[PDB]
Design an enzyme around this catalytic site. Structure first.
Site, PDB file in Angstrom:
ATOM      1  N   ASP B  25       0.793  -1.223   0.000  1.00 40.99           N
ATOM      2  CA  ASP B  25       0.000   0.000   0.000  1.00 40.99           C
ATOM      3  C   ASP B  25       0.833   1.285   0.000  1.00 40.99           C
ATOM      4  O   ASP B  25       1.342   1.710   1.046  1.00 40.99           O
ATOM      5  CB  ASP B  25      -0.922  -0.057   1.232  1.00 40.99           C
ATOM      6  CG  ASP B  25      -2.033   0.989   1.220  1.00 40.99           C
ATOM      7  OD1 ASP B  25      -2.097   1.818   0.299  1.00 40.99           O
ATOM      8  OD2 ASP B  25      -2.855   0.978   2.157  1.00 40.99           O
ATOM      9  N   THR B  26       0.945   1.912  -1.171  1.00 38.92           N
ATOM     10  CA  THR B  26       1.689   3.165  -1.312  1.00 38.92           C
ATOM     11  C   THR B  26       0.937   4.325  -0.650  1.00 38.92           C
ATOM     12  O   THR B  26       1.500   5.397  -0.432  1.00 38.92           O
ATOM     13  CB  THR B  26       1.922   3.536  -2.790  1.00 38.92           C
ATOM     14  OG1 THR B  26       0.662   3.616  -3.469  1.00 38.92           O
ATOM     15  CG2 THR B  26       2.822   2.510  -3.475  1.00 38.92           C
ATOM     16  N   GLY B  27      -0.345   4.111  -0.372  1.00 43.12           N
ATOM     17  CA  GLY B  27      -1.163   5.126   0.274  1.00 43.12           C
ATOM     18  C   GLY B  27      -1.188   4.998   1.790  1.00 43.12           C
ATOM     19  O   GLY B  27      -1.974   5.664   2.460  1.00 43.12           O
TER      20      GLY B  27
HETATM   21  C1  LIG Z   1      -7.569   7.431   2.968  1.00 41.82           C
HETATM   22  C2  LIG Z   1      -6.231   7.362   3.705  1.00 41.82           C
HETATM   23  C3  LIG Z   1      -5.041   7.255   2.752  1.00 41.82           C
HETATM   24  C4  LIG Z   1      -5.042   5.953   1.937  1.00 41.82           C
HETATM   25  C5  LIG Z   1      -5.221   4.702   2.800  1.00 41.82           C
HETATM   26  C6  LIG Z   1      -5.502   3.474   1.948  1.00 41.82           C
HETATM   27  N1  LIG Z   1      -5.669   2.356   2.641  1.00 41.82           N
HETATM   28  C7  LIG Z   1      -6.059   1.113   2.009  1.00 41.82           C
HETATM   29  C8  LIG Z   1      -5.901  -0.053   2.998  1.00 41.82           C
HETATM   30  C9  LIG Z   1      -6.475  -1.392   2.540  1.00 41.82           C
HETATM   31  C10 LIG Z   1      -7.855  -1.664   3.125  1.00 41.82           C
HETATM   32  C11 LIG Z   1      -7.788  -1.763   4.640  1.00 41.82           C
HETATM   33  C12 LIG Z   1      -7.545   1.376   1.749  1.00 41.82           C
HETATM   34  O1  LIG Z   1      -8.219   1.991   2.581  1.00 41.82           O
HETATM   35  N2  LIG Z   1      -8.040   0.981   0.582  1.00 41.82           N
HETATM   36  C13 LIG Z   1      -9.452   1.171   0.262  1.00 41.82           C
HETATM   37  C14 LIG Z   1      -9.669   2.475  -0.523  1.00 41.82           C
HETATM   38  C15 LIG Z   1     -11.113   2.744  -0.940  1.00 41.82           C
HETATM   39  C16 LIG Z   1     -11.503   2.027  -2.224  1.00 41.82           C
HETATM   40  N3  LIG Z   1     -12.802   1.927  -2.476  1.00 41.82           N
HETATM   41  O2  LIG Z   1     -10.642   1.570  -2.981  1.00 41.82           O
HETATM   42  C17 LIG Z   1      -9.966  -0.036  -0.511  1.00 41.82           C
HETATM   43  O3  LIG Z   1      -9.274  -0.579  -1.376  1.00 41.82           O
HETATM   44  N4  LIG Z   1     -11.178  -0.460  -0.177  1.00 41.82           N
HETATM   45  C18 LIG Z   1     -11.795  -1.615  -0.822  1.00 41.82           C
HETATM   46  C19 LIG Z   1     -11.913  -2.773   0.174  1.00 41.82           C
HETATM   47  C20 LIG Z   1     -10.668  -2.976   1.023  1.00 41.82           C
HETATM   48  C21 LIG Z   1     -10.803  -4.160   1.962  1.00 41.82           C
HETATM   49  N5  LIG Z   1     -10.661  -5.434   1.260  1.00 41.82           N
HETATM   50  C22 LIG Z   1     -10.796  -6.626   1.836  1.00 41.82           C
HETATM   51  N6  LIG Z   1     -11.081  -6.712   3.132  1.00 41.82           N
HETATM   52  N7  LIG Z   1     -10.659  -7.734   1.116  1.00 41.82           N
HETATM   53  C23 LIG Z   1     -13.168  -1.258  -1.374  1.00 41.82           C
HETATM   54  N8  LIG Z   1     -13.964  -0.640  -0.632  1.00 41.82           N
HETATM   55  O4  LIG Z   1     -13.428  -1.593  -2.548  1.00 41.82           O
HETATM   56  N9  LIG Z   1      -4.220   4.662   3.854  1.00 41.82           N
HETATM   57  C24 LIG Z   1      -4.522   4.202   5.063  1.00 41.82           C
HETATM   58  O5  LIG Z   1      -5.610   3.697   5.333  1.00 41.82           O
HETATM   59  C25 LIG Z   1      -3.416   4.290   6.106  1.00 41.82           C
HETATM   60  N10 LIG Z   1      -3.471   5.644   6.674  1.00 41.82           N
HETATM   61  C26 LIG Z   1      -2.573   6.578   6.371  1.00 41.82           C
HETATM   62  O6  LIG Z   1      -1.598   6.363   5.644  1.00 41.82           O
HETATM   63  C27 LIG Z   1      -2.748   7.941   7.039  1.00 41.82           C
HETATM   64  N11 LIG Z   1      -3.998   8.103   7.791  1.00 41.82           N
HETATM   65  C28 LIG Z   1      -4.994   8.886   7.379  1.00 41.82           C
HETATM   66  C29 LIG Z   1      -6.217   8.959   8.296  1.00 41.82           C
HETATM   67  O7  LIG Z   1      -4.977   9.508   6.315  1.00 41.82           O
HETATM   68  C30 LIG Z   1      -1.525   8.132   7.942  1.00 41.82           C
HETATM   69  C31 LIG Z   1      -1.495   9.532   8.535  1.00 41.82           C
HETATM   70  O8  LIG Z   1      -1.556   7.153   8.990  1.00 41.82           O
HETATM   71  C32 LIG Z   1      -3.642   3.216   7.195  1.00 41.82           C
HETATM   72  C33 LIG Z   1      -3.416   1.818   6.609  1.00 41.82           C
HETATM   73  C34 LIG Z   1      -2.709   3.462   8.393  1.00 41.82           C
HETATM   74  C35 LIG Z   1      -1.229   3.492   8.051  1.00 41.82           C
END
Ligand SMILES: CCCC[C@@H](CN[C@@H](CCCC)C(=O)N[C@@H](CCC(N)=O)C(=O)N[C@@H](CCCNC(N)=[NH2+])C(N)=O)NC(=O)[C@@H](NC(=O)[C@@H](NC(C)=O)[C@@H](C)O)[C@@H](C)CC
Lengths: 99, 99
Positions: B25-27
């Site tokens: 995760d680059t994000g």
């Molecule tokens: C919005 C914040 C920046 C991007 C985000 C992307 N995280 C991935 C993590 C993987 C899931 C837990 C994510 O949320 N991806 C989502 C993005 C939304 C999207 N729709 O794509 C995703 O793919 N969600 C999928 C499902 C994921 C779960 N999948 C599964 N359980 N099989 C979906 N909804 O389709 N980063 C984060 O969540 C990280 N947070 C951060 O980097 C920063 N925090 C904040 C609040 O910005 C930093 C200050 O800590 C977490 C991991 C802590 C280090």
């Protein structure tokens, strides 16, 4: 270009003709942009993250420029902590992870 | 190697003597691993993203092998739905985004 990860991979994007900054996110399935006015029809859906689920507006076939690279696809608009460019558009611009 | 983004960039990692699958995760600023009984001292912190924040345990100097590449750094352990490899470790294995 080649982007290292010592800093957040933030790039300038153009959407709805407006410039914004977004995070290139390989851990995001979809592209989620902060609430904004966007020309197009939308559908409400729910997406998940590390802390739970949020509701977003799903816009399809939206023209967007990412770091000067063209992509036309699905853009989710909602209360995201940060603008993120997910895999749906990263694949469109030919982005890959390398190490 | 090169990892395309057609599907979730998952790789095998080794931490605390166990093999697990994790998302590159680059994000993500930091690394968040599923609940596991990692030995040693830790610090209670809160980390978040979409959906809000979660309580995790911050372990320092944790040895972790990502896709065959050794690294050592801070690892957060808690109720994350996915094992997440963040930038703190991606930089250590020389990972870059390219397009
Ligand atoms: C919005 C914040 C920046 C991007 C985000 C992307 N995280 C991935 C993590 C993987 C899931 C837990 C994510 O949320 N991806 C989502 C993005 C939304 C999207 N729709 O794509 C995703 O793919 N969600 C999928 C499902 C994921 C779960 N999948 C599964 N359980 N099989 C979906 N909804 O389709 N980063 C984060 O969540 C990280 N947070 C951060 O980097 C920063 N925090 C904040 C609040 O910005 C930093 C200050 O800590 C977490 C991991 C802590 C280090």
């Amino acid at each position: 270009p080649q982007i290292t990860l010592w800093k957040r991979p933030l790039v300038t994007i153009k959407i709805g003709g407006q410039l914004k900054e977004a995070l290139l996110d390989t851990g995001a399935d979809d592209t989620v942009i902060e609430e904004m006015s966007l020309p197009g029809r939308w559908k409400p859906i729910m997406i998940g993250g590390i802390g739970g689920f949020i509701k977003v507006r799903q816009y399809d076939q939206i023209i967007i420029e990412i770091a000067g690279h063209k992509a036309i696809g699905t853009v989710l608009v909602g209360p995201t902590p940060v603008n993120i460019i997910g895999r749906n558009l990263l694949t469109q611009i030919g982005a890959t992870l390398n190490f």
